[PDB]
Amino acid sequence: MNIFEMLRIDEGLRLKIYKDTEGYYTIGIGHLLTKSPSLNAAKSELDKAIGRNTNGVITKDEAEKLFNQDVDAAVRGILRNAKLKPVYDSLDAVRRAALINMVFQMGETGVAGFTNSLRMLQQKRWDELAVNLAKSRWYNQTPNRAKRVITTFRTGTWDAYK
Numbered sequence: 001m002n003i004f005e006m007l008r009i010d011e012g013l014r015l016k017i018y019k020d021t022e023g024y025y026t027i028g029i030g031h032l033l034t035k036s037p038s039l040n041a042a043k044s045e046l047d048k049a050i051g052r053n054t055n056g057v058i059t060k061d062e063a064e065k066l067f068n069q070d071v072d073a074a075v076r077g078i079l080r081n082a083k084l085k086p087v088y089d090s091l092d093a094v095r096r097a098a099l100i101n102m103v104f105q106m107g108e109t110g111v112a113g114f115t116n117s118l119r120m121l122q123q124k125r126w127d128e129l130a131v132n133l134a135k136s137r138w139y140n141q142t143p144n145r146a147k148r149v150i151t152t153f154r155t156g157t158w159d160a161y162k
């Protein structure tokens with residue numbers, strides 16, 4: 001298991017523009033296109049991202065390119081972030097993947113905001129962090145996914161994914 005395989009399970013793969021869990025236009029492997037209510041606006045962002053007239057449809061290869069870019073960006077975002085970087089550096093490889101996952105899903109800012117959990121992560125208080133993370137909109141909206149991520153932090157293993 002690795003971050004790519006982990007996120008592909010969590011996000012799935014869609015080749016046609018679709019609406020995410022929040023109602024936003026997305027495509028491929030969790031690639032958010034836009035928060036705006038317009039499909040056209042979505043189609044424009046998509047063509048701009050792909051570099052061609054897609055007509056709201058991409059290929060597998062293209063979906064994977066988006067995904068590579070997004071993972072890379074999440075990692076880079078963590079490392080450039082004052083609050084995130086140190087947490088990240090303090091963690092083992094499996095737990096780093098869980099943090100990347102969260103960043104990928106809710107962006108650097110959102111995560112950077114879980115002050116208390118960040119402190120617990122750093123202090124390696126596994127069980128308390130798991131409790132704390134569940135008290136969130138995030139857990140309430142996408143519970144199965146959150147549970148997988150939480151177990152990952154709690155145990156430091158890939159069990160929830162195997």
Ligand SMILES: [Cl-]
Nearest residue numbers: 048049050069
């Ligand atoms: Cl893009």
Ligand SMILES: [Cl-]
Nearest residue numbers: 142143144145
């Ligand atoms: Cl879910």
